[PDB]
Write an enzyme that holds these catalytic residues in place. Structure first.
Site, short mmCIF file in Angstrom:
data_model
loop_
_atom_site.label_atom_id
_atom_site.label_comp_id
_atom_site.label_asym_id
_atom_site.label_seq_id
_atom_site.Cartn_x
_atom_site.Cartn_y
_atom_site.Cartn_z
N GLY A 195 -3.21 7.93 -2.46
CA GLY A 195 -2.65 8.24 -1.13
C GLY A 195 -1.15 8.02 -1.07
O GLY A 195 -0.56 7.64 -2.10
N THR A 196 -0.55 8.25 0.11
CA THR A 196 0.88 7.96 0.41
C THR A 196 1.02 6.46 0.66
O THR A 196 0.01 5.80 0.92
CB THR A 196 1.43 8.80 1.57
OG1 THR A 196 0.98 8.27 2.82
CG2 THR A 196 1.05 10.26 1.49
N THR A 197 2.23 5.94 0.55
CA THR A 197 2.52 4.49 0.66
C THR A 197 2.56 4.10 2.13
O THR A 197 3.34 4.70 2.88
CB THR A 197 3.85 4.13 -0.04
OG1 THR A 197 3.84 4.69 -1.35
CG2 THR A 197 4.07 2.64 -0.07
N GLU A 220 4.63 6.51 4.59
CA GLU A 220 5.25 7.69 3.93
C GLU A 220 4.42 8.91 4.33
O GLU A 220 3.21 8.92 4.02
CB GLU A 220 5.30 7.40 2.42
CG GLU A 220 5.52 8.61 1.51
CD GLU A 220 5.38 8.32 0.02
OE1 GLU A 220 6.33 8.62 -0.73
OE2 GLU A 220 4.32 7.81 -0.41
#
Ligand code: A1IF8
Ligand code: MG
Lengths: 231, 240, 235, 243, 244, 195, 211, 250
Positions: free
Chosen positions: D29-31, D46
């Protein structure tokens, strides 16, 4: 591979294959385009005939006076999801005297799709939907994927060769977004966008399906000679 | 509840559980129905691998559904009871609500419906049973003969056979049944039915049962000796 | 084994695709829509000469303005017919009018994907649904076990279908008379039928605004077969 | 083998491989991050810009529970929304009976027990999200992180998704260089910096920063999104530190 | 999900046989032999207890012969615990029919019911069939003396003399040889023990390995008596016939 | 409703049942058969609430006819009566009890003996030489107490019933438009077409 | 006030056309005969709703019977769907008095009374409603089996006029049906307004009334 | 969720075996030895209190359990399986007998009910058989003293004396030599202690042996006086001390 038997099984790299296969049924479906200005939102759907003796499969379902979607993939799944939207738009109207927000329709679709990804015996929805609506925050376009992922966009396209229209709309962004108080110009830009996803076949009178919703325009679907204008 | 889909499709559009049910019917003792001009005769094989049996109390192969309709079968005997009980109940339910006994076609269509349901219900296997359903419609003098099978398809038959070596006796009936002139009498009809079983049965002893259904709720099972006379005449006319 | 509601890596339902194979095996059925009516014809395909072929009911009435021909596991068509008839009469009760042919078809197709671990498997039968309504005139629909239905000017289903569909592609125009469509169905049946076409192993039917849905007597169908043989001998 | 083909099956190691695979969906996934400050918590995530067709500031990922709790996740977004929907039910049923808005430790165990329940049976799939949530209750600020297994702990700072190692380093520094604690307005800047720094591992597509916060002083102990000038001031402070 | 572990106990083989039924039948072929013999003036039930001990309390022991009502008894071949579930169900049909019609249940109706239950476990539910075959010895005023058998498949049939459990082939051949229709209960008793005596897997047939029961009109006037023989009585009938 | 009599003689049972069906101040019909054949040697007469009477009669009939087919055998009058009683006794503790009283007249072919059972809507069963439901009993019981003998012929049985109908046509307020009379003997059930 | 009687020449069915809510006359132009199919009439008396809903429902159930069985339903089985239906509602307070009148081939001309207490009766003559006793009086004293179609029609019409006059709740007009082997034939709406005076003059009857 | 295991986990193999019952009998074989000897005037049931740790208080683990005042049970195999069976056994003596007839069930019928619960676990959806064999000793007024064995299958048999688990084969052979039909209870206790010594490796004293009797009524253990017909329970667990006294005459 060994982890594609049912939706309730992660692969060793954290993938859900049943969902990715359902996503596949969308690529195989006919092309459809969404795009909006600040005043109007437009669905352009290429309809697909089985042969010359057959009708062209209706891609655009109306959900309320201010909302409706276009489908790519399993049409019976777009019926079940659209029917669910029709109820939620309707429940909002009857109980709150309140037109259901385009954003909140997205959240509700997402969450319905999700329950079919985490439970044994079910299956993911095998269709992608483009929702357009005018509501209390103006024109809106949503892209629904049966993973449960919903995304608010200026414009987009799903189905076979969609990538042509999605590049063209990525170029035209600053032009078509400024088509305010001019419906027929926003439809042109929609018809010119879907054209970038055509090969061999071209847009004929019983091929093309267009919808529009806007500031003082009920969600209305144009089929047949109505769309001869735009060919 | 046990929900498991046991009857599913295979890559070549076959429902194997329905097809393996037909295999249980092939294994079953033979059954034949021959409709005459004014009667239908049901004929049923009795495998002679069981002797020291009690023939008074052993379940007979022909079951009365109502006073005017009978059901014979090939396949799993235990399965056949469930179908006969469901038909006998519907037969009384029809009398109670329509003030009329079922037609032979209505009873057949019901039993066939029940067999079909068990091919797309979870938790259940198809019936290992094919049926001949014969008799006369209330106040009608036209003979009726219908066949059902595990899939639930049903159809009318001038004459028909089901079970083991039904291929051979269907062959026989196909050359020895004339649609333009069906067995005019009860004598002729029972003779053609015993003949058709004598192609497959082995001994013409306690291996053949014969039931005669005439119009207006007239049903009579022949005895050993009455059948044994038809066995004696058919082989004395053959020594030629 | 594996889920009944499971997607193949190409994004299709296995059980749906496998049922579509069962349907290919079933006896032929042909519909042709005209401006004078819709015609439905079927191959009976009796398994033995002892089977009283008129007991083969593969063309069925749903209401007075809607008939239906089937092809495949025809036993599965019973609960679908029951639903269609109940839908048509129920609509008539709640609204005092005839139910639209599309709306009737859409109600039948709503059953089709009600399978899982509801019924245990999809239907093994395709339906040609032919009717008339004031709104959309004379109509022919194909109702697959996928839950999809397409409207057709003409459609063949069953063993003969890709052969028959190619032939219907050429022969069909918007100005066919009813009498023309009848011969056209008998013609294309005779082509794709195993046994030689006669009034006992092939049934005709039509739906007209005036007379509703009419399965043809064997005598009437026999006159049209005799009329076909002469007009094909003619040139 | 075959121990990884069915959820709630122990391997001979004593592990549940379906849970460990969910973690992969998470790592993909995104941070997203959490920073506990003096009187509150700051969330940040993010949001990858896949296309210029994404309407900036519209696809909001951070979700409110009740009026005082922030939840942000990484992994399958729909899984996260399903968990927040349950959370809202838990926070509604707790308020209904006990009158007081749900305390954060109590809220965390409501999510904990629910996720943990999805590792008890082969008929459900574990959650494909690590979730970072917290807020201000009667006992002050609390930050929690919760994993597909049902495991959760209190955190001074939390990070999950593709840039977690990078973020965890930047967090570890702040804990060491601020023992007396950080201010909410300070934590908003730092949050922006740690998302810009953690974006190096997703550096293909350009991204859209999203911050939210609950602070006893700065928001009255209510969850609010960081918008307009205070967001621009944070994006500015962030862009300055990478250059 | 769960499907991975489902045996599918109610399916057809490609041949058209029911796996679990055929395998439960295999199970019953290793159980102690049970014999039923029907005479003109009564029915004999006789069964062999499986390799007993010297420390098994034989006089308070019942594995083979159970009373269903005052007119009907069964001989069990297969899993005792499975048999006790069915016996308790049959005992309740018998008492329901007697409550409803104020007449003792006809034997063939009770037998059909127990056979219908069994049949259920072979067509629906997903459970294993009952590893049990029954010899029903009964009397009613319609058919007089009646001997039945039922098996896991839920199929049932009437008999003049029949065996279930171990070595039935061997036992059926000896009964087929010495049975006659005009036979009497004393003659049938003697036939029953001679049969077991030769088909027994044991060295010698002794009282402590037998269960014995006669349904006689040997009850004073127009009524029926059930005798579940005591150890000492089996020992006396073994000397009388001259097998010990 | 109101008039159902039964008398068991030597070798038969005689059921006499009123032909009147009255709703409000109109006699709607004057030829009503308040009876159902349950089996060839068992007849059931019934009186009670509108609708319930026939729904109960026809329901019992359908069950007995089902039993007959399944067993290819005819239940004894005793067995049928016990079945019927238990149905009523179950009904009395239902949401809406069947408000129906019955006489069951049967010839037992095993015992060669006629049998009359009287059962009320509560499920109260008794075997009687003679019976009646409702007001009729107030006249006919004392009458039969005097004139009955166990060893009477069917012809004497019918004369004894004529005495009962005359007494009822003299002293009852309502016009029950005569009775239909049916004899249950060893040869089955037949209607006496002149009474 | 509804009646139907069998005769030599088939079946006569006559109904008034009045709807009352207590003493308030709700309508004089209401329809009390539902034409189920070309050989099946139902008469309505009682609750206006209860009758209209469950009788047009009976029409649907008769339609399903001919689709499913390829054959028009028996008056017996038609009457028995209605009587079985109301019998499930017994005690709930449905109010209905109906005569299912029709000709099928097996049955000949057939009339079944069905009321909301579950009474189902076959018969040659029925009168149903508040006006029923008035209709019975005229009908019962003029009825022969051997009436001509023309006499029988009139005697039906005249029996409704009778009740329309005396019974406060009957009135409006008379609707006439004749049921044969060829099916039902409608013999017009007759406004009691004119019919009374025409009948009185022509017949010389109704001498209780100021001429 | 929902238990979607609605199908049998015990099925017939082609050989006609029920694998899961056979495997259950294997788990019982591994189990610690327990035995039962029936005297003329009582029954003794005994087992070894195999202490997992020496820190563990083996007194707090009841291998021998009172089911009714006149019935006790002991086992071999899986202690947890046994514990929940004692729970269900005690409750079923109440619900299906005592709350109907107002007296405790006779030994053979309580056994019958334990047997039934064990059978259902061989056929019910989504469960495995119980991994125990029970010896149940009891007394009722019409059957006197009795001793039954109950297997994972649900089968149960009456014994004069027997043993189950680890050292059963040897223990059964030992009882066959010593058992006559004239034994007094004390004689049957003396033989139970001998028979149990053969199967035990380490310590052999009143703190490693659990031994209960079904004997005479114990008015001293009733709790109340004033009803003559209530004379107290027949079941009695012997004390550590009571076992050790009998080990000096061994
Ligand atoms: C011959 O005998 C006629 N008698 C007169 C009659 C009025 O009693 C009636 O039975 C008619 C028959 C109807 C007429 C309409 C078409 C269907 C048959 N019955 C009524 O008119 C009926 C009387 C009710 C008393 C039982 N009227 C109503 O129910 C009226 C009609 C209405 F519109 F006004 C509404 N209503 C009501 O009574 C009220 C408003 N609601 C209810 O009754 C609700 N139900 N409950 N509880 O005709 C014979 C043919
Ligand atoms: Mg009484």
């Amino acid at each position: 591979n060994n982890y594609d038997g049912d939706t309730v099984t992660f692969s060793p790299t954290g993938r859900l294959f049943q969902v990715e296969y359902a996503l596949e049924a969308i690529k195989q479906g006919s092309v459809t385009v969404g795009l909006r200005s600040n005043t109007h939102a437009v669905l352009v759907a290429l309809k697909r005939n089985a042969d010359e003796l057959s009708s062209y499969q209706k891609k655009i379902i109306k959900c309320d006076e201010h909302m409706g979607l276009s489908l790519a993939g399993l049409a019976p799944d777009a019926r079940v999801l659209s029917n669910y939207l029709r109820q939620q738009c309707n429940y909002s109207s009857l109980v709150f005297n309140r037109k259901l927000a385009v954003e909140r329709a997205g959240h509700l679709l997402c969450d319905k799709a999700q329950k079919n990804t985490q439970s044994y015996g079910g299956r993911p929805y095998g269709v992608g939907l483009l929702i357009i609506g005018y509501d209390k925050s103006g024109a809106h376009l949503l892209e629904f994927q049966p993973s449960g992922n919903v995304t608010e966009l200026y414009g987009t396209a799903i189905g076979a060769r969609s990538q042509g229209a999605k590049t063209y709309l990525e170029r035209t962004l600053d032009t078509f977004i400024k088509i305010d108080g001019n419906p027929d110009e926003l439809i042109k830009a929609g018809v010119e966008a879907i054209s970038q996803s055509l090969r061999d076949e071209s847009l004929t009178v019983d091929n093309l399906s267009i919808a529009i919703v806007g500031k003082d325009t009920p969600f209305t679907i144009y089929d047949g000679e109505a769309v001869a204008k735009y060919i | 509840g046990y929900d498991r889909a046991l009857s599913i499709f295979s890559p070549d559009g076959h429902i194997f559980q329905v097809e393996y049910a037909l295999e249980a019917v092939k294994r079953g003792t033979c059954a034949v129905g021959v409709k005459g001009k004014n009667c239908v005769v049901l004929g049923c094989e009795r495998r002679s691998t069981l002797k020291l049996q009690d023939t008074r109390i052993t379940p007979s192969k022909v079951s009365k559904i109502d006073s005017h309709v009978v059901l014979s079968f090939s396949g799993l005997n235990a399965d056949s009871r469930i179908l006969i009980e469901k038909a006998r109940v519907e037969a009384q339910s029809h009398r109670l609500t329509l003030e009329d006994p079922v037609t032979v076609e209505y009873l057949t269509r019901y039993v066939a419906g029940v067999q079909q349901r068990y091919t797309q219900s979870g938790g259940v296997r198809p019936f290992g049973v094919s049926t001949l359903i014969a008799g006369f419609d209330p106040r009608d003098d036209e003979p009726k003969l219908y066949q059902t099978e595990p899939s639930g398809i049903y159809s009318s038959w001038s004459a028909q056979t089901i079970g083991r070596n039904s291929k051979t006796v269907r062959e026989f009936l196909e050359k020895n049944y004339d649609r333009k002139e069906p067995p005019a009498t009860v004598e002729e009809c029972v003779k053609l039915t015993v003949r058709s079983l004598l192609e497959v049965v082995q001994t013409g002893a306690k291996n053949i049962e014969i039931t005669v259904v005439k119009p207006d709720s007239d049903i009579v099972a022949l005895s050993s000796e009455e059948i044994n006379q038809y066995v004696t005449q058919i082989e004395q006319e053959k020594q030629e | 084994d594996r889920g009944v509601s499971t997607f193949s890596p190409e994004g299709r339902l296995f059980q749906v695709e496998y049922s579509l194979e069962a349907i290919k095996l079933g006896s032929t059925a042909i519909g042709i829509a005209t401006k004078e009516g819709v015609v439905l014809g079927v191959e009976k395909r009796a398994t033995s000469p002892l089977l009283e072929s008129d007991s083969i009911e593969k063309i069925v009435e749903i209401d007075r303005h809607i008939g239906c021909a089937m092809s495949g596991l025809t036993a599965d068509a019973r609960s679908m017919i029951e639903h269609a008839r109940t839908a048509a009469v129920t609509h008539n009760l709640y609204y005092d009018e005839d139910i639209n042919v599309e709306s009737l078809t859409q109600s039948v197709c709503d059953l089709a994907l009600r399978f899982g671990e509801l019924m245990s498997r999809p239907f093994g039968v395709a339906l040609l649904i032919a009717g008339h309504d004031a709104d959309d005139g004379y109509q022919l629909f194909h109702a697959e076990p996928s839950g999809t239905f397409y409207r057709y000017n003409a459609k063949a289903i069953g063993s003969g279908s890709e052969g028959a569909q190619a032939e219907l592609l050429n022969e069909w125009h918007s100005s066919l008379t009813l009498k023309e469509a009848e011969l056209l169905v008998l013609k294309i049946l005779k082509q794709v039928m195993e046994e030689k076409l006669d009034e006992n192993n092939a049934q005709l039917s039509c739906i007209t605004k005036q007379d509703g849905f009419k399965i043809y007597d064997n005598e009437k169908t026999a006159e049209l077969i005799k009329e076909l043989k002469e007009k094909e001998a003619a040139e | 083998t075959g121990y990884d083909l069915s959820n709630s099956v122990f391997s001979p190691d004593g592990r549940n491989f379906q849970v460990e695979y969910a973690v992969k969906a998470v790592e993909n996934g995104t941070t997203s991050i959490g920073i506990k400050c003096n009187d509150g918590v700051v969330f940040a995530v993010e949001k990858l810009i896949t296309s210029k067709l994404l309407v900036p500031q519209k696809n909001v990922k951070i979700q409110v529970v009740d009026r005082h709790i922030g939840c942000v996740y990484s992994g399958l977004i729909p899984d996260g929304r399903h968990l927040v929907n349950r959370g809202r039910e838990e926070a509604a049923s707790f308020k209904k009976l006990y009158k007081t808005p749900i305390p954060i430790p109590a809220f965390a165990d409501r999510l904990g027990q629910y996720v943990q329940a999805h590792t008890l049976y082969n008929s459900v799939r574990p959650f494909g999200v690590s979730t970072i949530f917290g807020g201000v209750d009667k006992n002050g600020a609390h930050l929690y992180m919760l994993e597909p297994s049902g495991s959760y702990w209190g955190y001074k700072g939390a990070a999950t998704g593709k840039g977690r190692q990078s973020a965890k380093a930047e967090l570890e520094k702040l804990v060491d260089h601020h023992p007396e604690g950080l201010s909410a307005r300070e934590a908003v800047k730092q949050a922006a910096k740690i998302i810009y720094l953690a974006h190096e591992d997703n550096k293909e597509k350009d991204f859209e920063l999203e911050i939210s916060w609950c602070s006893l002083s700065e928001t009255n102990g209510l969850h609010k999104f960081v918008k307009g000038d205070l967001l621009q001031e944070a994006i500015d402070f962030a862009q300055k530190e990478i250059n | 999900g769960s499907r991975r572990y489902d045996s599918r106990t109610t399916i057809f083989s490609p041949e058209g046989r029911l796996y679990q039924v055929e395998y439960a039948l295999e199970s019953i072929s290793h159980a102690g032999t049970a014999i039923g013999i029907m005479a003109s003036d009564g029915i004999v039930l006789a069964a062999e207890r499986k390799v007993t001990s010297t420390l098994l309390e034989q006089d308070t022991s019942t594995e083979k012969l159970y009373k269903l009502n005052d007119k009907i008894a069964v001989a069990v071949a297969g899993l005792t615990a499975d048999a006790e579930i069915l016996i308790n169900t049959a005992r309740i049909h018998a008492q329901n029919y007697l409550k409803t019609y104020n007449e003792d249940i006809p034997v063939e109706i009770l037998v059909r019911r127990l056979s219908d239950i069994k049949q259920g476990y072979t067509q629906h539910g997903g459970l294993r069939p009952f590893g049990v075959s029954f010899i029903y010895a009964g009397y009613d005023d319609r058919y007089g003396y009646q001997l039945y058998t039922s098996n896991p498949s839920g199929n049932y049939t009437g008999w003049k003399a029949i065996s279930v459990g171990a070595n039935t082939s061997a036992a059926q051949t000896l009964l087929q040889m010495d049975y006659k229709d005009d036979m009497k209960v004393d003659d049938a008793i003697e036939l029953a023990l001679k049969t077991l005596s030769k088909t027994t897997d044991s060295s010698a047939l002794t009282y402590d390995r037998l269960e014995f029961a006669t349904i006689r009109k040997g009850a004073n006037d127009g009524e029926v008596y059930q005798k579940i023989f005591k150890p000492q009585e089996i020992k006396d009938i073994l000397v009388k016939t001259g097998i010990t | 409703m109101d008039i159902i009599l039964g008398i068991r003689v030597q070798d038969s049972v005689i059921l006499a049942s009123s032909k009147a069906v009255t709703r409000g101040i109109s006699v709607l019909k004057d030829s009503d058969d308040k009876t159902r054949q349950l089996s060839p040697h068992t007849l059931m007469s019934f009186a009670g609430e509108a609708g319930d009477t026939v729904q109960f009669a026809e329901y019992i009939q359908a069950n007995i006819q089902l039993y007959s087919i399944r067993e290819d055998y005819e239940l004894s009058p005793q067995a049928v009566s016990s079945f019927v009683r238990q149905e009523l006794a179950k009904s009395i503790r239902s949401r809406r009890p069947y408000q129906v009283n019955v006489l069951i007249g049967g010839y037992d072919k095993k015992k060669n003996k006629p049998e009359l059972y009287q059962i009320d809507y509560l499920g109260t069963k008794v075997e009687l030489p003679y019976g009646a439901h409702g007001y009729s009993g107030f006249y006919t019981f004392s009458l039969l107490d005097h004139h009955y003998r166990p060893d009477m012929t069917t012809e004497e049985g019918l004369d004894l019933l004529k005495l009962c109908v005359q007494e009822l046509e003299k002293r009852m307020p309502m016009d029950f438009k005569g009775v239909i009379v049916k004899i249950v003997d060893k040869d089955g059930i037949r209607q006496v077409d002149d009474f | 006030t509804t009646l139907a009687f069998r005769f030599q020449g088939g079946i006569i069915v006559a109904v008034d056309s009045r709807a009352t809510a207590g003493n308030w006359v709700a309508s004089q132009t209401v329809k009390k005969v539902i034409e189920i199919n070309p050989f099946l009439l139902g008469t309505m008396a009682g609750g206006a709703a209860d009758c209209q809903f469950w009788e047009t429902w009976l029409g649907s159930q008769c339609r399903l019977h001919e689709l499913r069985e390829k054959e028009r339903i028996s008056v017996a089985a038609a009457s028995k769907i209605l009587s079985n239906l109301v019998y499930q509602y017994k005690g709930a307070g449905l109010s209905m008095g109906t005569m299912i009148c029709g000709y099928t081939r097996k049955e000949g001309p057939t009339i079944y009374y069905v009321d909301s207490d579950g009474t189902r009766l076959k018969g040659d003559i029925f009168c149903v409603g508040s006006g029923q006793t008035f209709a019975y009086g005229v009908l019962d004293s003029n009825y022969k089996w051997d009436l001509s179609v023309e006499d029988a029609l009139y005697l039906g019409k005249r029996s409704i006029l009778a009740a329309a006059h005396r019974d406060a709740y009957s009135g409006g007009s008379v609707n006439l049906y004749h049921v044969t082997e060829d099916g039902w034939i409608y013999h017009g709406n007759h406004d009691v307004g004119e019919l009374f005076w025409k009948v009185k003059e022509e017949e010389g009857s109704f001498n209780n009334v100021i001429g | 969720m929902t238990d979607r295991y609605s199908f049998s986990l015990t099925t017939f193999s082609p050989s006609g075996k029920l694998g899961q019952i056979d495997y259950a009998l294997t788990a019982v074989k591994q189990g610690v030895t327990s035995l039962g000897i029936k005297a003329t005037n009582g029954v003794v049931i005994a087992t070894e209190k195999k202490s997992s740790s020496p820190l563990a208080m083996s007194e707090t683990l009841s291998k021998v359990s009172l089911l009714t005042p006149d019935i006790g049970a002991v086992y071999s195999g899986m202690g947890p399986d046994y514990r929940v069976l004692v729970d269900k056994s005690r409750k079923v003596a109440h619900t299906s007998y005592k709350r109907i007839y107002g007296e405790y069930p006779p030994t053979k019928l309580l056994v019958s009910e334990v047997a039934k619960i064990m059978q259902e676990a061989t056929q019910s959806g989504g469960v495995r058989p119980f991994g125990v064999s029970l010896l149940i000793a009891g007394h009722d007024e019409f059957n006197g003293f009795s001793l039954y064995q109950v297997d994972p299958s649900g089968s149960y048999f009456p014994w004069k004396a027997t043993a189950i688990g680890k050292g059963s084969v040897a223990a059964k052979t030992f009882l066959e030599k010593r058992w006559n039909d004239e034994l007094e209870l004390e004689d049957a206790i003396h033989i139970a202690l001998l028979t149990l010594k053969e199967s035990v490796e380490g310590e052999f004293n009143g703190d490693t042996i659990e031994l209960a009797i079904i004997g005479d009524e114990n008015p001293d253990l009733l709790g109340y006086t004033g009803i003559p017909t209530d004379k107290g329970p027949r079941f009695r667990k012997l004390t550590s001390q009571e076992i050790n006294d009998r080990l000096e005459a061994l």
